[PDB]
Symmetry: C2
Subunit: 302 residues, 2 copies
């Protein structure tokens, strides 16, 4: 029993992190087979970020402008190319620690682990969710660009995120591993802001089920409700609307606890309209929305 913000073990990813230096800019890269992936703004000077033309900046570089370091070993750059917002650096040595991997793009509301890195060196691991406004509420300092987010699926590392920048509000924006941004952001210094964030309703419900499984029951009630009456209240409190697919996804947790989804929705409706009244749920005084149904099952069953 117990319930924690749990990340995937990072060992398989740690062996792929490298340092990439171009000019006076150094950040992190991901070394898989004989390719190093890193944010394309490594080729920018401190002044280039105001309004970069990456095609021009790249043609003015050659392979020897790129210093790639894997621990103490130097990797020789053999070729380079740009794919959307990522640089692909071909190197002379294939990473012998290359795990089985996939590149996947995730959806808002899904979670992943982040391996925060500096100078190519892993510093910490934490769990977060892709927000409905396509930002993540990460923890990143200057130099963390190129850090990656991932899930582990049996033996296979699914890479889903590469960090590029922090927005003025203190949240974080990045790309998938094909270089395509999450959300309407660009890798240049402007006045971009994130849109309105909402609460991930299916995740809040999954977490209430985790609470019941761990013996927190004070918020349950006898009432039930319909999908339509719930969503009407959810809209008023900035909660994502709830669909029949969400209900199906929560099935395993409903089965294990004997509490129907629409019954749990009635409890959620109550907590939104009355608050928590100084009670807590799994050690929190707010409703948590960064655990998926799958996260809960993994932690409360195996």
């Amino acid at each position: 029993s117990g319930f924690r913000k749990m990340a995937f073990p990072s060992g398989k990813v740690e062996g792929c992190m490298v340092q990439v230096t171009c000019g006076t800019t150094t950040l992190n890269g991901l070394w898989l087979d004989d390719v190093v992936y890193c944010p394309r703004h490594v080729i920018c000077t401190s002044e280039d970020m105001l309004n970069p033309n990456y095609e021009d900046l790249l043609i003015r570089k050659s392979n020897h402008n790129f210093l790639v370091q894997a621990g103490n070993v130097q990797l020789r750059v053999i070729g380079h190319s740009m794919q959307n917002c990522v640089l692909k650096l071909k190197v002379d040595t294939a990473n012998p620690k290359t795990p089985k991997y996939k590149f996947v793009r995730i959806q808002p509301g899904q979670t992943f682990s982040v391996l925060a890195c500096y100078n190519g060196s892993p510093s910490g691991v934490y769990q977060c969710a892709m927000r409905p406004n396509f930002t993540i509420k990460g923890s990143f300092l200057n130099g963390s660009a190129g850090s990656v987010g991932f899930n582990i699926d049996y033996d296979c590392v699914s890479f889903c995120y590469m960090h590029h920048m922090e927005l003025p509000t203190g949240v974080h924006a990045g790309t998938d591993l094909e270089g395509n941004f999450y959300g309407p952001f660009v890798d240049r210094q402007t006045a971009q802001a994130a849109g309105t964030d909402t609460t991930i309703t299916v995740n809040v419900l999954a977490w209430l089920y985790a609470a019941v499984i761990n013996g927190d029951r004070w918020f349950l009630n006898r009432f039930t409700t319909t999908l339509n009456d719930f969503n009407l209240v959810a809209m008023k409190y900035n909660y994502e609307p709830l669909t029949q697919d969400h209900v199906d996804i929560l099935g395993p947790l409903s089965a294990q606890t004997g509490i129907a989804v629409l019954d749990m929705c009635a409890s959620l409706k109550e907590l939104l309209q009355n608050g928590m009244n100084g009670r807590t749920i799994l050690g929190s005084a707010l409703l948590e929305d960064e655990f998926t149904p799958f996260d809960v099952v993994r932690q409360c069953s195996g």
Copy 2:
């Protein structure tokens, strides 16, 4: 910027986890050089736990009663011995992935990362604190015994915790790596309960500094207070008393923010006497006490 519950990268520890089977009991072990460390209750049957005599149970075993598996490889047990509440299994092969390591015993209020494992296989990583009552609020299912807690100190893994059991209240108890329990617990099924937990005051203060660094300032005030007047209020709310050593430890955060410790204590005194009034601090509606001053510096400076 941002602030997360951040664990250490687990790669160096993942390479040391093995599965240990004795009879029908299988749990996790830690394989360092040519020794596998695991909880001694692996030698107990489901009925032995009621009142075990470990000296008797161990003399009735031989090396071949112990099945040690490192992935697909079988490790041959060459000898065994008991050290306090841990078994030391001598094996024929030294772990080639043995990191530089130390065995250290930690103090209440200190934090560490936990690599939760099942059947010798790493499942997740999370951060927690040793509570003042010598329990940890972990997340563990049946079969997690032998999972370890650790800190990373530059290149060196400091092992500080091995998991043994869950108490009736849902919290967790274990030993250091020399087999000595944290707290007044024993590895046998009785009616042991944890004593009263208190809030780790120096950690709450460190976290308020992390909030200020990240732009949360609404709880600050002009007042100041003395060590003695604060501790009088702290006692009433079940907070650990605050000492001059704590003040010194918080120095770097006071320096970086320009807010003196005793000034921050005055803000804490206010939050205890009036509550948070529906405001949050770093995304929490409760005062968090599981980040040390060192955790904050690591995350908010580097």
